[PDB]
Structures are given as C-alpha cells and as structure tokens.
RNA sequence: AAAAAAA
C-alpha cells in the first residue's frame with residue numbers, strides 16, 4: 001500500500017451543504033438533516049473529507065483534525081449517503097462498522113447518529129445498533145434482529161464476540177469500517193483485536209476480500225499510522241487528509257494552557273483544591289470542569305476529597321472503568337446537560353467524549369500516554385467555544401513537559417510554582433475519612449502507574465518513585481513514615497534488588 | 509498493584 005498527502009490550505013474554495021446538494025454528492029434527505037442543526041456551516045475537516053470518502057475505491061482515507069472540529073459528522077455524513085446510494089441492496093445488512101476505544105464514546109457516536117434521525121424521520125429506515133460491553137448481550141442481538149441495522153458502532157471486545165457468532169448473518173456486506181481515535185486503536189492491546197475484526201470482515205465479504213473501505217480519524221497521528229495500519233487497509237492507495245500544519249502543534253489553539261509545578265506530588269492535590277475554590281468563588285459556582293487523574297483508586301480518592309468541600313457548591317461526578325456501565329452512561333448524559341459540576345475521571349474520558357461548554361480541564365499528574373495530553377485538554381474549547389487547561393505536577397515530572405516540546409512541539413507559556421500552606425493541608429487531610437490501609441492501596445496504584453511510563457516520559461526512576469511513594473507519608477501527616485509492606489510483596493514487586501525499594505517501603 | 513477493552 002502507498003500513501004499520498006494532501007496538506008492544509010488557507011485560500012481553499014468554500015464547500016457547503018447547498019454545494020453538495022448541487023454536484024450530486026449528497027441526497028436531499030441528508031441535506032435537510034444537517035441544515036436543521038443550525039450550524040453556521042461545515043467545519044474545515046467536514047468540507048475536506050465528505051468527498052472523496054464517497055469517491056470510488058480504491059481510496060482509503062486518513063483525516064487529521066484538532067479536537068472539537070466535528071470529526072464525528074465528518075464520517076457520519078458520507079455513511080448515510082452511501083446507505084441511500086445503496087438503498088435497494090442488502091437493506092437488512094450491516095454496511096458500516098464504526099469502532100471506538102471506549103464504551104461511552106461508542107454510545108456517544110450512536111447518539112449522534114440518532115440525532116440525525118431526529119432531524120429527519122426519513123433517515124430512520126437506516127437503523128443503528130450499538131454493540132458494547134457492559135450491556136445485555138441477548139437484548140443487543142434481539143435489537144440486531146428487530147431493526148436489521150445498516151450502521152453498527154462498537155468497541156473491539158464486544159464486536160469480536162458477536163462476529164465470532166453472527167458474522168454470516170449481518171456482516172457479509174460491509175462496505176465501510178471506521179476507526180475513530182485511530183492511533184489509540186492501533187496501539188498495543190488494541191491492534192491485535194482490530195486485526196481480528198478486520199480479518200473476519202474481509203474474509204466474510206460477499207464480493208471481495210479487499211472490498212471494505214477503511215477510514216482512520218484522530219486529532220493525533222503521523223505517517224507512522226499507515227505503517228501500523230498496513231494490515232487492515234485493503235485499497236492499493238490511501239490519501240491523507242489534514243487540516244493542521246505539519247509543524248503546528250496538534251493541540252487546539254484556543255486553549256489557554258498553564259502549568260502549576262510543586263515540590264512534592266501530594267502538593268498538586270492541595271493546589272488543585274485551591275484552584276477550584278478560587279474558580280467557584282470567582283465564577284459564582286457557575287463552573288463546569290473535568291479533573292483527570294492517573295489511576296482508578298486515586299480518582300475515587302480525589303473524588304472523596306472534592307465531595308467533602310465542594311459538594312455543597314457543585315455536583316461531583318466519579319467516572320472510571322470500575323463504575324458500572326449503567327452508571328457510566330447515566331453519568332455521561334447528566335454532565336452533558338448540566339451547566340455546572342466537576343467530572344473526576346481516569347482516561348476513559350480523555351478521548352472523544354463531547355461535553356458542551358466545559359470551562360476548564362484540570363490534571364493531577366501525567367496522562368496514560370503522551371498523546372492523551374492533547375486529548376485531555378481537548379475536552380474543553382470545543383465547537384467554537386473557548387476554554388483553558390491547568391496541569392498540576394511536581395518537580396519530578398518536568399521531563400514529561402520537555403518531552404511534550406520534543407515530540408509534539410507542544411510549548412506551554414504560563415508556568416508557576418506552588419507550595420501548600422499549613423492551613424489548606426490541615427483542611428484536606430482532616431476531611432479524609434479513609435483508613436491507612438486504604439491510603440496504602442491508593443499510593444501503590446500511583447507507584448504502579450508512574451512505574452509504567454518511566455521510559456516513555458524520560459523520567460528518572462531513582463527520583464520519581466520515591467517521591468510518589470512519599471505521598472503516603474503526607475496523607476497520614478508523617479513525611480518520614482514509609483508504607484508498610486510484606487517481604488513477599490516487595491520481592492513480588494521486583495524492587496527488592498533496587499536501592500529505591502528501601503527508599504519507598506518499610507518491610508513490616 | 510497499574511489506563512482502556514467480550515462473560
């Protein structure tokens with residue numbers, strides 16, 4: 001497979017819905033649906049991609065647009081059009097398969113399809129079904145039989161389950177497959193799954209094993225994705241669409257980024273509380289923000305702190321992989337609607353999730369992966385609206401910020417140091433209603449988390465892991481105290497041979 | 509222990 005590049009262009013010709021109703025690209029049924037939405041016009045990415053996504057194969061696509069540019073519709077418009085173009089063939093078969101890295105994002109994409117339906121009841125005939133984990137498998141199949149969807153949105157796990165069972169029944173006539181947040185879906189832990197999905201869909205296609213057309217979408221990707229997606233793309237040639245300069249930062253321009261650096265990792269906690277407290281007062285509780293954290297246990301803990309002194313002011317929402325899928329969905333629908341509130345989450349909500357009018361994005365610690373910094377702050381400043389972001393870290397996480405300049409050319413201007421007063425520390429710590437053995441588990445999680453991204457972020461192992469583990473002493477208000485561990489555990493950790501192990505743990 | 513992702 002060979003790639004071709006069509007970069008950004010400022011003095012490009014304007015494309016519009018009326019212009020696509022002319023030229024015979026889009027049917028009138030779709031033209032209505034999007035016009036009803038009262039958008040001033042198609043976003044840059046949407047204008048550039050609706051064709052040649054519809055154009056004749058062979059021609060796989062790869063789009064590159066910043067966060068909040070409406071990439072969803074940018075591949076949802078052509079799919080509906082193709083479904084209209086092929087109305088009288090395989091009308092009871094899946095023709096488009098969309099894959100997303102998280103359940104909530106897959107459900108979001110489904111909702112966006114269902115919005116298009118709401119804007120034009122004539123499009124409802126092209127049914128849609130979400131195939132996701134944490135939902136009733138049987139009920140999903142019953143819905144699969146009842147509606148006979150032309151569009152399937154799914155997450156890799158559940159999708160392989162149904163394909164191994166019912167690929168002959170629904171998926172023998174797929175023409176399009178979409179990888180939303182493509183780069184993540186092509187990373188280790190997802191790549192094998194998507195190769196299994198692609199292989200099954202290609203193997204069972206009625207016409208040709210190279211029939212399916214693959215679309216890759218994300219706000220962060222390079223030329224290395226074509227190399228990494230060579231096994232899932234059938235067409236002889238693939239054209240790369242791009243609405244951001246190669247040198248320009250992948251992050252969104254309208255985001256006012258800032259860094260709050262501290263001595264200790266635990267210091268970032270107090271800094272975040274004070275920053276929120278200022279914001280609530282300064283905005284008169286008219287504050288909608290998302291706070292990211294490294295681990296599930298630390299999110300739950302951070303959520304407990306925020307509830308203890310902001311629940312009076314704002315709603316505090318806990319969102320992570322260990323939340324039941326019913327609560328996750330119910331939580332997502334609320335925060336989408338609410339004008340205010342604090343969403344405390346892991347990287348489940350780093351990518352794709354569209355929460356209207358988020359004022360700020362806060363971060364305690366580093367993200368799961370380098371690229372996810374761009375996606376994290378991308379939760380705000382969406383669809384024209386403005387926004388800012390704050391990154392809370394200690395003086396041992398600067399290599400992450402420097403790596404941000406080396407790799408993704410993400411330079412950040414506003415930076416300031418922070419030191420916690422004795423007053424704020426007493427307030428927070430006195431409000432913690434958690435046993436030392438619970439504090440233990442939380443701190444170990446962070447050690448495990450930061451141990452996992454040492455190489456990627458160019459950290460100094462001998463410095464960070466002690467500092468991370470040291471938070472256990474801070475929370476119990478006894479700095480020199482070390483977290484008690486078993487000889488079998490410390491050995492099981494592998495740090496038994498390291499001098500760093502003694503600097504982190506006390507074998508009790 | 510460790511972010512997602514089928515029971």
Ligand SMILES: Nc1nc2c(ncn2[C@@H]2O[C@H](COP(=O)(O)OP(=O)(O)O)[C@@H](O)[C@H]2O)c(=O)[nH]1
Nearest residue numbers: 039041042043067068069070071072073354383
């Ligand atoms: N103003 C405007 N907003 C749009 C347009 N297309 C989509 N949106 C909005 O942009 C928001 C987020 O878009 P999204 O699909 O998440 O963009 P993505 O992050 O690149 O995938 C949605 O809530 C849409 O309502 C458009 O053409 N104009």
Ligand code: BEF
Nearest residue numbers: 066067068219352
């Ligand atoms: F780029 Be993501 F879909 F906001």
Ligand SMILES: [Mg+2]
Nearest residue numbers: 071072180352
């Ligand atoms: Mg998106």
